[PDB]
Amino acid sequence: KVFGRCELAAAMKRHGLDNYRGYSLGNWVCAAKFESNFNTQATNRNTDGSTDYGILQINSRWWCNDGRTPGSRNLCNIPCSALLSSDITASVNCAKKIVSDGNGMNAWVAWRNRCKGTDVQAWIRGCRL
Numbered sequence: 001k002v003f004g005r006c007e008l009a010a011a012m013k014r015h016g017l018d019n020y021r022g023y024s025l026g027n028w029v030c031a032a033k034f035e036s037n038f039n040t041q042a043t044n045r046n047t048d049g050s051t052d053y054g055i056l057q058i059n060s061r062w063w064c065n066d067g068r069t070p071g072s073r074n075l076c077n078i079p080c081s082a083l084l085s086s087d088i089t090a091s092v093n094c095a096k097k098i099v100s101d102g103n104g105m106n107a108w109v110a111w112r113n114r115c116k117g118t119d120v121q122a123w124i125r126g127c128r129l
Contacts, residue, residue: 001086026120054083088122
């Protein structure tokens with residue numbers, strides 16, 4: 001599923017991402033924009049053999065199992081395929097674990113490089129939230 005901008009904002013807010021760990025709803029939508037282009041089915045293979053999955057490109061070395069990543073921890077205890085569903089519940093639940101690991105949203109390389117420090121409120125513009 002390719003989410004609309006305000007569509008994902010409403011979905012993320014409902015699942016309690018708004019100001020989760022102090023990160024405004026704009027930061028999460030911004031992250032999801034540059035990670036997956038609001039595409040739930042987004043998959044990207046990393047150089048280390050792992051793969052990022054879903055709306056927030058969650059890695060398969062630490063957070064989910066895809067069966068093809070040596071040293072997989074699966075700390076969110078889910079198949080990585082579950083991170084591709086149109087329902088972003090699994091992605092949000094795992095993202096909460098990721099953003100709570102200590103380094104916040106810096107875990108997302110795209111966020112630190114394209115969202116961090118920017119006017120992220122602009123991502124929830126016009127959205128009836």
